[model samples]
Target: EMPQPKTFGELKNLPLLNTDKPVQALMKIADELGEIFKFEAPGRVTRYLSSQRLIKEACDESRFDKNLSQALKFVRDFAGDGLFTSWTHEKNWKKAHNILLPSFSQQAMKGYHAMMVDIAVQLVQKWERLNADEHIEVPEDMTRLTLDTIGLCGFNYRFNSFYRDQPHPFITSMVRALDEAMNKLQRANPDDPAYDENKRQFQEDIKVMNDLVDKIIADRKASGEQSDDLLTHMLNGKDPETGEPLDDENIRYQIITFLIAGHETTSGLLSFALYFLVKNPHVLQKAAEEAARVLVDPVPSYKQVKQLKYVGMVLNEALRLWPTAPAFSLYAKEDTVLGGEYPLEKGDELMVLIPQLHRDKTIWGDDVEEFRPERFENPSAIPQHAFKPFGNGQRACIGQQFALHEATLVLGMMLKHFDFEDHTNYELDIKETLTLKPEGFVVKAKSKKIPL
Candidate 1:
């Protein structure tokens, strides 16, 4: 017999939702109340779907569409109509999206390849200089890698994140703002202590970060030195079909958006991928073998990075377990039944709980808990809408290719040059902000001295 939906999740376990690990509460709720259920909060109920069957149903474009998540809406003040946070109606989004297409295009990636290697070399060099036994913080260093990658390729600038214990002032402000935004999203108390302090600090941080980007743009323009980068593309590139161009304000939003959106999630992906590789030694051995076979050159060519099919599988599997951009929000177009189960109303809020969605036992099978890249051995064989760590159709992460390419290249290079030992015999602890990352995780990276 089918059980009736219960109204106990949010009101009963709301505190757990606010606890150190809020996602655990949601995972528990999925177990308690089947895949498609709702949290009957005070005014409205929010339905969350994680089952592959239910997710596939809600993915129907006619029945549903993107309704920006509360977090992303919160992010808009900072991001404006930037690609990631833009409304569908906004012209800036479509225009910039088209212009930036060439930025991540195959030809563009080839252009960025050397710059990507430039940062990878910096990372490997840093690891080489580290004390052989020093436990390098995996998450922290991954942040440095992604930031520098975007800094150079995005604008032909250098943050030199690896050298300073602290990154550039812009990044510090950016993360600090993200920190506040995360806190404010979970803000149950308006009058809590430090609310005002945090408020003013965050506002100032926004201004400070803005100042840096503004300066970067002004200086670039004044220097009158034309360079081939994201900034140059934005300033000069036009929409391929529409022949539209981005205004300076839109360009600024994009620069901020690219810096924030570009680095953070990819950093998380790489960090988590490293954590998995260290934890599962057998998998690591095979992955390293692939790296050795392909990246035989002093500096891996663009051709070699794309050859990392096995490494791509590892990244896919890692994303299945822990997608960096956790959940994206959507809402129904009208009242409808989801997965032939619960009835949803017009404007009914829905969240695709990606972690749980990927863990759908029926789709991923019983060994869902295990880390097995072989499941993605043939990515085409995977079911539709089943594996979307990047995101859904069209509005999917524009940076998807960029992130994977950067991650694959770096991981391939790392596997080729470093022998990593799991430091502290670490256990996974996630730290969530805009994206999810392994918290306090450390690994000892001993250089294989395979010079670049």
Candidate 2:
């Protein structure tokens, strides 16, 4: 090693990582995922398709918009399968849609349309009440934001959880319980009895959270009123294709899935995007300009989100740098070779990391580490395999579009309302659990002095 290590060595001292292994690994995976996103696949989003293939197809514009009925059915069956213990997605979405979406007479996603606005209002009000004198610091837990967003927007429920004053009990407990369960997975060791104990406790905690969500769903359903939100649509939606009501269990599964997906994934993207923009003032300023130009008033409509190009680039770059849920784990049931190579055993778990692929020099260029939005100027030149923030193939996220739309709308609204500053001279502390998140970055915010 040189007496003074040049170039990237200095980054090792940065707060992004404690060990070079994780970051380098992340870069490597970003490169690989990027290539996967770009080249090796004919259908660009197969890596992210999941059982949610219908919506993923719709999101990718591969399927006709008329297929939303089939898309909703895919969500229903997959969420309700009990293959995974968490099956509250449909229920929660129904709750949200019932409460708000009905307000609009002639609009797409009537109650759903108000979901973002509802959550934004909740957040803004909380900010006003708590930081009446100044701006409040956003939380490090991205899950709470997403969970809360669902409570407000998707569920139409006021889960003022993660608030400064008094957070909601259900939200607080749900997050803690879920986190403990995750920690158990991380600490699992077959030889240790302690691991077994923790594993049991983690499973128990997950059950409790799931039960609580289910109860909420049951109560909401008993109320017998319907609205235009996701929940209501599902409850009232006679499948355009089948003309049948979605079963109760199926509804619950979809709601839970929506709530979890809506909260965590979008929150993860927002957290990283917010941090990256703040760290790079020039990018931050441009994003702010675009947001301000797009919306003159409080709420950010769906149409406005389309025009925020710079904002979109900032998000894309943030996602590229720190993709939340960056990897996918798949099992090969039959003997096969991937891309005619990378041989795998039937039981072997194949983990594909998107963050690694996004940063690969071979696909993204040698300057892959540099943050450049201009690369997206011509989205065609970029190979499909190089980008899979959502994923590739039929297993990608169903709510990917919903998440992106929510982030764009929320961020656009937020940028126009507030300005961020680094109160502590701390580098980014990246952590990964369910989503890529910051351990801590003590950012301060103040109301933007919108010029009169």
Candidate 3:
């Protein structure tokens, strides 16, 4: 037997639907409501979904354009209309998306592969320098590794994040800016004493991030140099529709978006993947054997990376359990019926709980809570729209391949060289800022002395 769907007025009073632990709350609601449910916030009504069929319909470009929620205006304000927050500016979005398409393509990742491998090797060397008794802060090191990877590959600028004792000024500024932006969204109250100060610091940090990118662009232009990097393409890119080039401001926004959004989420991906592997020794042993067998070269070629079948399964399982970007809100541009049942008005908002969907008991079955890579060993085991770690539809992540390539490479290299131990015995301590990240997770590793 199922619980009756709550009336709109009743939905508003259901405190569980709106809370700090929204992912867990949403899962409980989905189990009771059977997929589609609606509730009202202070200023608007939201429809939440954990059904694969409904998610497929909502994300389809023909049915709904990828419109960001009004609450994301602050994200737009912080990044200045980059790809991630460009729903409001559709015209700019089309032009920019097309122009930047080549930068994230398979061929482009081939060009960027060398830099990624170099950075991954640097991280391995850093870990090697540490004594066997010492443990590395997993999330922090993962952040540094990814920051360095995206920095050099995206813009041909070196952050040297792992080499330096202190992070680059731009990294510091980016962190503060994201923290401030999330605070505005999550803790909004006019009566709060620190509201004005928070806003001021956020603005200052935005300027710092933007100005740094601007300087990078200027330096490249002054040198009259060209490199096969994303920044190079963006710098000289033009609108295929109109012959005009992308303005400097928009270019900077895209660069910052790539640096911050790209690296942050993927770092979390790697961090969680390692955590899951360390906790599950059987899976860890299998993944290590696969990595060693496939990654014969000191640094694997793009073709070689494609051979890491088991490593891929491990990563997919990790993302399913802990999606880096757990949730997103999409607005209805016009009145439409969801799954040909639930009626939504023109202004209705859909709060897509990605974590709950990934772990839906209906789709994943009773063992949904278990860490089983075998589910992904057979692609047919999971249905489409059921595994949306990177999201779905036309608005899916452009750098999906780029992130996958880098993660697979790093994980393979680590597994080939060392065996990780669960020193801290930590469970997931999730921090939901702009992205979902594991806070204060650490792991110890010993060199396996297996030849690269």
Note the Cα lDDT for every prediction shown. Answer: 0.83, 0.54, 0.78
Error of 3 at 396 (Å): 0.9
Q: Which ranges of candidate 2 are over 4 A from the true structure? A: 1-111, 128-135, 140-145, 162-167, 171-174, 177-181, 185-192, 196-200, 233-250, 345-348, 449-452
Q: Number of clashes in every candidate structure?
A: 0, 62, 0
Better of 1 and 2 by TM-score: 1
Per-residue lDDT tens digits of candidate 3, residues 237-353?
A: 887887667787788778888888779888899999998898899999999999888888877899878889899999999899888877777767788888777777776778777
Per-residue alpha-carbon lDDT of candidate 2 for residues 1-452, written as tens digits (9 for 90 to 100): 10111123323212222232343433443333332321111111122211121112223322211111112233232344321222223333334333323322235433354666666656545444445444344544344556666665555565655453554454454455445433433221434876676556545645655676676676567766554455565566664334455567656665665665567667778887877777778888888888888877666666777678887878788888777766554444545444443343454333355566565666777786777777777779877556778755434554565676667777777688778776676577765444556656556667665531
- How accurate locally is residue 266 in candidate 2, as Cα lDDT from 0 to 100? 75
What are the RMSDs of all candidates, in order?
A: 2.5, 9.7, 3.0
Task: Pull out the clashing pairs in model 3.
Answer: none
Q: Alpha-carbon error at 239 in model 2, in Å?
A: 6.1
lDDT of 1 by residue, 1-452 (tens): 23324444545323434555555557667767767766544454567777888888877888887778767887887888989888765788778988987888898899999999999999888888887478787888899999989988988878888988866777778878876766655555646885889878878988987887887788778876667888988899998767878888899899899988889999999999999999899999999999999998999999999999999999999999999988887888899987775777898888888898888888888988899999998767889988878777667888889999999999998899888888688889998775789999988887777867
Candidate 2, after superposition: displacement of residue 396 in Å? 1.7
Residue 229 of model 2, lDDT score: 56
Off by over 4 Å in 3: 1-34, 166-168, 187-193, 450-452
Candidate 1 global lDDT: 0.83
